[PDB]
Amino acid sequence: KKIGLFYGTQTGKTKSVAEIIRDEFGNDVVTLHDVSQAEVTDLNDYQYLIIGCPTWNIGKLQSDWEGLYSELDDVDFNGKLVAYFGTGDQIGYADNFQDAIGILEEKISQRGGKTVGYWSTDGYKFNDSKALRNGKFVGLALDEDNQSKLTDDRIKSWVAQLKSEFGL
Ligand SMILES: Cc1cc2nc3c(=O)[nH]c(=O)nc-3n(C[C@H](O)[C@H](O)[C@H](O)COP(=O)(O)O)c2cc1C
C-alpha cells in the first residue's frame, strides 16, 4: 500500500518493533518486508519508506541490510520520503550506538531520499553514533536490551509524528 517498511533482523527485536509500528499506523498502511527475502527493486514500489536496521558487531550493518547496501546504487530514491528506526544497546556499545541507520541514511539521502522522522537523543546514555544529525538521531532509536519499558510509547509518539511528516 502506502508505506513500505523494510526491516533487517538477527535476533528478532527490530521485527517486533516493526509489528508495533504497523499496529500504530492503522491497518493497511504499512507493509512489513524482511530484507532477507527482498530484492533491491522492491523499494521502487513505494513513495513512502520506513527503513529498520539494528547495529551488529561493533558498528556494522545487520547482514541482510549489508546484502543490499551496494545495490542501493541501483535505485532512484528521488521524490521519496524515507524514515529510519533501529534497535540497539547503548550501554554495551556506547561508541557505535545506532550506527546502522546512520550508514543507511547517508547512502539513501545521497541517492535522493528526503529524510523525515528525526528523533531526540534525550534520555539515552551513549558516546558516539553515526545516526547523529545536528544534535538528533536520524530516526527512532529503540533499546530493547536496556530500555524495553520505553519502546511502546516511543513508537506511538514516533508514528503520530510520521503521519504529519508523510502527510497521511
Ligand atoms: C555481538 C553483538 C554486537 C552488537 N553491536 C552493537 C552495536 O555496534 N551498536 C548497537 O547499537 N548495538 C549493538 N548490539 C546490540 C543489538 O543491536 C541489539 O541486541 C538489537 O536489539 C538486536 O536487534 P535484532 O534482534 O533485530 O537483530 C550488539 C549486540 C551483539 C550481541
Q: Please give the angle made by the CA atoms of 146, 87 and 56, to the nearest 5 degrees.
A: 100
* Method of structure determination: X-ray
Angstrom distance (rounded) from CA 55 to CA 62 = 6
The best mutation among 34, 55, 99 to test binding of ligand 1, ranked by most ligand atoms within 8 Å of the C-beta, falls on: 55
14 CB within 6 A, ligand 1: yes
39 sits in which H/E element: none
Domain range for 89 is: 1-168
Q: What is the resolution of this structure in A?
A: 2.3
- 85 C-alpha to ligand 1 centroid (Å): 13
Three-state SS at 119: strand
From the number of C-beta atoms within 10 Å of its C-beta (0-12, 13-18, 19+), residue 122 rates as: exposed
Angstrom distance (rounded) from CA 68 to CA 35 = 8
Angstrom distance (rounded) from CA 138 to CA 125 = 16
Q: How many domains does the chain have?
A: 1
Q: Which residue's CA is minimally distant from atom 1 of ligand 1? A: 57
26 CB within 6 A, ligand 1: no
Angstrom distance (rounded) from CA 39 to CA 137 = 27
- 168 C-alpha to ligand 1 centroid (Å): 32
Q: Within the chain, how many helices (H) and strands (E) appear?
A: 4, 11
- 75 C-alpha to ligand 1 centroid (Å): 28
Three-state SS at 103: helix
Any idea which residue has 527503513 for its cell? 51
C-beta of residue 150 within 8 angstroms of C-beta of residue 120: no
Angstrom distance (rounded) from CA 17 to CA 153 = 11
Q: Which residue's CA is minimally distant from atom 30 of ligand 1? A: 56
Number of alpha carbons in the 13 Å side-chain half-sphere of residue 57? 6
130 CB within 6 A, ligand 1: no
54 CB within 6 A, ligand 1: yes
Q: Specify the CATH number for the domain of residue 111.
A: 3.40.50.360
Angstrom distance (rounded) from CA 49 to CA 157 = 18
- 79 C-alpha to ligand 1 centroid (Å): 32
